[PDB]
Design a protein around this ligand. Sequence first.
Ligand SMILES: O=C(Nc1ccccc1)Nc1cccnc1
Length: 460
Amino acid sequence: QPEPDMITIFIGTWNMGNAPPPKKITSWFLSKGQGKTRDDSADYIPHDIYVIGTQEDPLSEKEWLEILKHSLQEITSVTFKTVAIHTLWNIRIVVLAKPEHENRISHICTDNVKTGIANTLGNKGAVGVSFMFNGTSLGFVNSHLTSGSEKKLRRNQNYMNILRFLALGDKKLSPFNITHRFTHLFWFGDLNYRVDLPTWEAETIIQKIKQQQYADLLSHDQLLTERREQKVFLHFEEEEITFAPTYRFERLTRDKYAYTKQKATGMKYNLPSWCDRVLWKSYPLVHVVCQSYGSTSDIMTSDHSPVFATFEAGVTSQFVSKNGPGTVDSQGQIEFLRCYATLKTKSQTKFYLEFHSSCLESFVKSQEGENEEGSEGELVVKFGETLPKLKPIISDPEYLLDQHILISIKSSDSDESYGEGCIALRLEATETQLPIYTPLTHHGELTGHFQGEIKLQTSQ
Ligand SMILES: O=C(Nc1ccccc1)Nc1cccnc1
């Protein structure tokens, strides 16, 4: 039985509003309702992995797992295996996979982050799961961020705390946060960003939604505007939104948005908003295609509608050769030519690089670079032709061209990373000098750039 080179992944996010679900939730897992929906001809075809994120979840883990497994068995006639379940307060993540994948999945990690301080610590935060699927690392984050239209900057702060402190994936990747640890990272939840229009415009917004005219609402969505201004979710993708706002509904119908201020809301307005979202970030030049992004219309126990997204995702096989794993493949090498880092720092420490990759036996430290002053104020760290030649464990081009090199630039004085990025080895040519580039981030914000040339030697 051949190892897959693609899988499909279901992502669900639902703020359940502290209510039990209705008897039937199959529409969610079938990607049926509003938006980019899944073709009826696929309804019996199971996804490889289902990742369910809930917020305000009133159920026990056992109670929700039974509902989810029942739901999938009714759709697919497959009994899914539980990969992981993790709950923080009423924020939960469940990962289910087809039984045929049980031996393909390993290195399962879970963690949570509690956001806020004192008053604002005790119900918001995130849970996450990561694992390896054959040679491919997968990460999943379900976050419930701060509520309220006038708290976008708190949400952004909650995002940075979660990506700094959530401890998933390979702990040896010490300079790297979750935004660099995975081939594919999915981040979803009740992110709680709102449509920023005046309160007086509530009925006008409702009208627009009834006309399925979302453009003038999406142009005020705080998540899209904060992402455009590089305030949050830098280097993440989101499919185009073509479904109505998923919050805030009267329960037991979807005919009414409940937006007016009430004692129950802390006298806050809840204008119709796209609170419930799925974003992703995959390594450069890895296949990832969104095949659905939408909301259900028939699950009405909460003041939010469930959101679904599905993905095709490239995966690779657990490569063995006669050499690697457990030795080098002398035939293989990676050379960096004429490389330099451009950093936004005011610091004047010397810097060195670390190269990390599962195609290396262990990470590689460079010599210190040569600091120059750039034209428009910046620090340029030149490495020239000084960088160590990297010796991959396997030289077969079918393996090596699918790998990635994570780069950290670290201060010699503190050994702290000032920037992290990722280079694909999926090159147009081998034995040929080719341009490479990555932005560098630290704590998920832009700190610089790394560019130069690469020369990759494979066994072919
Ligand atoms: O995010 C954007 N591009 C991108 C995404 C991932 C990696 C690198 C670049 N563009 C964007 C964002 C928000 C509004 N309009 C455009």
